[PDB]
Amino acid sequence: VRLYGPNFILQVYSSKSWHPVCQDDWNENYGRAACRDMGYKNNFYSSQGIVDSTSFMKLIYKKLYACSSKAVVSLRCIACGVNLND
Amino acid sequence: IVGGESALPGAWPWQVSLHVQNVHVCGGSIITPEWIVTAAHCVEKPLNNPWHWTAFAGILRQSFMFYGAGYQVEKVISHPNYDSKTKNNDIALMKLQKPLTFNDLVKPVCLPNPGMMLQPEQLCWISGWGATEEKGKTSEVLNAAKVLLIETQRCNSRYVYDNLITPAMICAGFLQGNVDSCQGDSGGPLVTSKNNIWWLIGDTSWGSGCAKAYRPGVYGNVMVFTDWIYRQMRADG
Numbered sequence A: 001v002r003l004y005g006p007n008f009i010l011q012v013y014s015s016k017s018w019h020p021v022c023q024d025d026w027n028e029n030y031g032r033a034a035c036r037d038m039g040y041k042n043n044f045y046s047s048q049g050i051v052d053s054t055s056f057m058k059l060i061y062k063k064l065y066a067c068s069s070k071a072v073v074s075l076r077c078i079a080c081g082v083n084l085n086d
Numbered sequence B: 001i002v003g004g005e006s007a008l009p010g011a012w013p014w015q016v017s018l019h020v021q022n023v024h025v026c027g028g029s030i031i032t033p034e035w036i037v038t039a040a041h042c043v044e045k046p047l048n049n050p051w052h053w054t055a056f057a058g059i060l061r062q063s064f065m066f067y068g069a070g071y072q073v074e075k076v077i078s079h080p081n082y083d084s085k086t087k088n089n090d091i092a093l094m095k096l097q098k099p100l101t102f103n104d105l106v107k108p109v110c111l112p113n114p115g116m117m118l119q120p121e122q123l124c125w126i127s128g129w130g131a132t133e134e135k136g137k138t139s140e141v142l143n144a145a146k147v148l149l150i151e152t153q154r155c156n157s158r159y160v161y162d163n164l165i166t167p168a169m170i171c172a173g174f175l176q177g178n179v180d181s182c183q184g185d186s187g188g189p190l191v192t193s194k195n196n197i198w199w200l201i202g203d204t205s206w207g208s209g210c211a212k213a214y215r216p217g218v219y220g221n222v223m224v225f226t227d228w229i230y231r232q233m234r235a236d237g
Ligand SMILES: *C(=O)c1ccc(CCN)cc1
Pocket: B130, B180, B181, B182, B183, B184, B185, B186, B187, B204, B205, B206, B207, B208, B209, B210, B211, B212, B215, B216, B217, B218
């Protein structure tokens, strides 16, 4: 599990390819599972879905298999990265 | 910080002053309410034990960091491959006994994600309480300066660091000097804004003197350590 790039795209590795995760079926309760899994404890911020690899992963983080259904997961585990001038 | 300017309130709300024996020693960067990223060289023996360490967040001036008002550090974790001779893998974690309260002056920086696609000479900022000249004293006020990433090839050339710059390192500054980190700033942040977010790109690590031509700052490349950091944070409990 990892977040990829400046838009926090939740990806999962083979088992030499990373593959993002479909926003089909996702909720802020499945969001927390991936966050704790990453080490962030009871920290959560946002788990919006964003625009689309070609192989995706559809539905904690072993309940998915490679799909397609519009929109991927953007997971933020913490409100970070802001200051005085935004 | 040589050649910077006083930080404004809440400009760098992730910056902490790390104190031993009632004085600033090191910088650090807040990533969670309880986790602070710093350099491994700061917590070498005999400062490896957490009891020696307190953290001040959200305060620009050393003279307003009062004895007994800091956050006791509870855990110190150095990178398993930290090599003090070469300064390779110079990252450590500090965990606070009590979580910080986030507000307008005290807030975390984002750990870098893979796929940042930074420019080769990405515009960054450095901050801290280091000397404002080579061999000077701790700065009373937090300072900050704009620096650019210096490409690894250039940084490793014969006339700069000559093959000392490993993949767990990144260089920044100006080869003419004048602007740089300095002693006291070490463990502190190198950050960059992208997609309207501030990211922790590096932790102030090493180099030759301060603000000299062809002797830029070297930072720990936090991107290569994020997975270790995630493991450390997950294992705690
Ligand atoms: C730590 O305090 C520290 C980091 C980097 C430098 C080199 C700047 N040229 C000095 C001290």
